[PDB]
Design an enzyme around this catalytic site. Structure first.
Site, PDB file in Angstrom:
ATOM      1  N   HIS A  91     -50.304  -7.883  40.234  1.00  0.00           N
ATOM      2  CA  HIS A  91     -50.729  -8.675  41.379  1.00  0.00           C
ATOM      3  C   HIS A  91     -49.579  -8.833  42.366  1.00  0.00           C
ATOM      4  CE1 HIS A  91     -52.428 -12.334  43.477  1.00  0.00           C
ATOM      5  NE2 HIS A  91     -53.473 -11.528  43.429  1.00  0.00           N
ATOM      6  N   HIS A 114     -54.848  -7.941  50.191  1.00  0.00           N
ATOM      7  CA  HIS A 114     -55.414  -9.235  50.556  1.00  0.00           C
ATOM      8  C   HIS A 114     -55.769  -9.277  52.037  1.00  0.00           C
ATOM      9  CE1 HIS A 114     -53.159 -10.322  46.817  1.00  0.00           C
ATOM     10  NE2 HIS A 114     -54.268 -11.006  46.603  1.00  0.00           N
ATOM     11  N   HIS A 123     -59.478  -6.595  42.989  1.00  0.00           N
ATOM     12  CA  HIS A 123     -59.434  -7.581  41.919  1.00  0.00           C
ATOM     13  C   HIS A 123     -60.466  -7.269  40.842  1.00  0.00           C
ATOM     14  CE1 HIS A 123     -57.255  -9.940  45.026  1.00  0.00           C
ATOM     15  NE2 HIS A 123     -56.640 -10.449  43.973  1.00  0.00           N
ATOM     16  N   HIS A 243     -61.697 -19.627  47.300  1.00  0.00           N
ATOM     17  CA  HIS A 243     -60.706 -18.862  46.550  1.00  0.00           C
ATOM     18  C   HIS A 243     -59.293 -19.384  46.775  1.00  0.00           C
ATOM     19  CE1 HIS A 243     -57.688 -15.496  46.593  1.00  0.00           C
ATOM     20  NE2 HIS A 243     -58.060 -15.492  45.325  1.00  0.00           N
ATOM     21  N   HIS A 247     -56.309 -21.713  44.239  1.00  0.00           N
ATOM     22  CA  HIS A 247     -54.937 -21.261  44.037  1.00  0.00           C
ATOM     23  C   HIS A 247     -53.946 -22.380  44.334  1.00  0.00           C
ATOM     24  CE1 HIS A 247     -54.780 -16.949  43.011  1.00  0.00           C
ATOM     25  NE2 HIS A 247     -55.969 -16.885  43.582  1.00  0.00           N
ATOM     26  N   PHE A 264     -48.971 -15.576  45.389  1.00  0.00           N
ATOM     27  CA  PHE A 264     -49.430 -14.295  44.865  1.00  0.00           C
ATOM     28  C   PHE A 264     -48.455 -13.712  43.848  1.00  0.00           C
ATOM     29  CE2 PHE A 264     -51.794 -13.557  49.100  1.00  0.00           C
ATOM     30  CZ  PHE A 264     -52.924 -14.178  48.606  1.00  0.00           C
ATOM     31  N   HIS A 277     -60.477 -15.524  39.196  1.00  0.00           N
ATOM     32  CA  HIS A 277     -60.949 -14.332  39.888  1.00  0.00           C
ATOM     33  C   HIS A 277     -62.139 -13.706  39.178  1.00  0.00           C
ATOM     34  CE1 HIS A 277     -58.143 -13.379  43.236  1.00  0.00           C
ATOM     35  NE2 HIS A 277     -57.395 -14.266  42.605  1.00  0.00           N
TER      36      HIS A 277
HETATM   37 CU   LIG Z   1     -54.955 -11.294  44.743  1.00  0.00          CU
HETATM   38 CU   LIG Z   2     -56.452 -14.998  44.178  1.00  0.00          CU
END
Ligand SMILES: [Cu+2]
Ligand SMILES: [Cu+2]
Length: 501
Positions: A91, A114, A123, A243, A247, A264, A277
């Site tokens: 990632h 992204h 993902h 999303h 995070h 990230f 995810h």
């Molecule tokens: Cu990601």
């Molecule tokens: Cu994510």
């Protein structure tokens, strides 16, 4: 000119993107994968379905398999591509500028999956191999990841399987202590906890799902994200919405870069990352099963032929394409759903605003000097392309609010809310999930050695909910929440987008 991942084993560099404080960084930035001298082979589909289970309704066997699997992965040497560290680095390598577009002929341009239409398919492949690796580590050929079902009330809090202490393989110390006490997730989190009842939080979480999958998720561009090819695309409704919120909600705000989940480069080090995810991947399925107009898959060759590179369960390098992950049946896995007919978020459209609760002079786009900075609440009237559209017209094209050229220092987390036609009398009871709320634009740090972005908001339902379908102009209100002290908006306009079939 589709995005193509290079030989990740040959061409790679330390992560230098999306990390505000590179000094005193808790996780490494050397996210390069192991070099086994492997040749990149083409992907081939598996044979006989993996049923992914809700993390909050798992049996002793299901939980034990997952715990024993992570423990086995944690036990592997770091040099192993199948290790906990190596998988987390995947990632980091793709999200923090580990690779470049050298294969496309541009070695000076970093690859960023992204904030683009590569978000979902990448993902999906990421979890696919991550899922098959764990299954092979415990000799479970039909092993399946759990998924954080935060679109269901009882599944909104972090499952207790991830809690406890270091004796638990699923535990991670680097989480927000204020949020691991069986508290409900905030799918519209902006960095500060809201002082509302649990009843209100759940109700608005459902609204957030409805907003991201229906209101704003009207077409492939608005849902998956903007077009991104080799050589500032729009961010999807899910990506910049629920999303991103999760995070920043799970990540430990005491750490330098909000590690682990809050960035990230470190997100992969938290086991809950993959389970989050897993449900984001599920949003894709639900988004299609709704069978609403415009809810179709991408057909652009530039997207289909885009590819990445991963290590599989057999330590073999495999190149996978986006065209081969649209069908879950071919990847041989799915999600265990509830017996109940409809989804509790399916009808979580914001309530109709009463005209009795509504009441003028605001500058228009012509009278305003752009670009404008969002260091305070900014209001402007935008000319609409049409008024009093029939049910047939609103069912043929979406009236979309576009906030383009969003320039800002992406060294830290940024977010601002967008309200449309907020003419509420000053004694009215407000809620988070009000009809005036069009949604927000949130971005996890992804700066490069000030970033520019674009947002999309559906107005088909909103204008009706605010009793302004007959008004020539729509009053758009931009409200900064965090990291907007330097944010800049370059253009604002409303356009009719035909629904693809
Ligand atoms: Cu990601
Ligand atoms: Cu994510």
């Amino acid at each position: 000119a589709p995005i193509t991942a290079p030989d990740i084993t040959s061409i790679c560099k330390d992560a230098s993107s999306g990390i505000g404080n590179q000094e005193g960084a808790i996780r490494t930035r050397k996210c390069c994968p192991p070099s086994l001298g492997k040749k990149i082979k083409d992907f081939q589909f598996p044979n006989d379905v993996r049923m992914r289970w809700p993390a909050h309704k798992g049996t002793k066997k299901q939980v034990d398999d997952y715990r024993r699997a992570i423990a086995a992965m944690r036990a592997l040497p770091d040099d192993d591509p199948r290790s906990f560290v190596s998988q987390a680095k995947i990632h980091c390598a793709y999200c923090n500028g580990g690779y470049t577009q050298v294969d496309s002929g541009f070695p000076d341009i970093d690859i960023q999956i992204h904030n683009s239409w590569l978000f979902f398919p990448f993902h999906r492949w990421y979890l696919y191999f991550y899922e098959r690796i764990l299954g092979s580590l415990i000799d479970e050929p039909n092993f399946a990841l759990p998924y954080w079902k935060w679109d269901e009330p009882k599944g909104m809090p972090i499952s207790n399987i991830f809690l406890g202490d270091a004796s638990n393989p699923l535990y991670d110390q680097y989480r927000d202590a204020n949020h691991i006490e069986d508290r409900i997730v905030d799918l519209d989190y902006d960095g500060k906890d809201k002082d509302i009842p649990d009843q209100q939080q759940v109700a608005c979480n459902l609204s957030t799902v409805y907003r991201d999958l229906v209101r704003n998720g009207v077409d492939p561009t608005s849902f998956f994200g903007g077009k991104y090819v080799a050589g500032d695309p729009s961010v999807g409704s899910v990506e910049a919405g629920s999303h991103t919120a999760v995070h920043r909600w799970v990540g430990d705000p005491t750490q330098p870069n909000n590690e682990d989940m809050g960035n990230f480069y470190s997100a992969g080090y938290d086991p809950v990352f993959y389970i989050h995810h897993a449900n984001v991947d599920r949003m894709w399925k639900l988004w299609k099963e709704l069978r609403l107009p415009g809810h179709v898959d991408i057909t652009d060759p530039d997207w289909l032929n885009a590819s990445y590179v991963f290590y599989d369960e057999n330590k073999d390098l495999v190149r996978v394409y986006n065209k081969d992950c649209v069908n879950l049946d071919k990847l041989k896995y799915n999600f265990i759903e509830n017996s109940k007919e409809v989804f509790p978020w399916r009808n979580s459209r914001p309530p109709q605003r009463r005209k009795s609760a509504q009441v003028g002079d605001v500058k228009t786009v012509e009278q305003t000097k752009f670009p404008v900075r969002l260091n305070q609440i900014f209001k402007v009237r935008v000319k609409r392309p049409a008024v009093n559209r029939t049910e047939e017209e609103k069912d043929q094209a979406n009236e979309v609010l576009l906030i383009k050229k969003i320039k800002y220092d992406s060294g830290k987390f940024v977010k601002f809310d967008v309200f449309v036609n907020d003419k509420l009398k000053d004694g009215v009871f407000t809620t988070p999930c009000d009809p005036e709320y069009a949604g927000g634009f949130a971005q996890i740090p992804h700066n490069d050695k000030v970033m520019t972005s674009t947002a999309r908001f559906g107005l088909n339902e909103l204008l009706e909910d605010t009793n302004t379908e007959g008004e020539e102009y729509a009053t758009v209100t931009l409200v900064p929440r965090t990291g907007c002290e330097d944010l800049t908006v370059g253009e604002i306009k409303i356009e009719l987008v035909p629904i693809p079939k």
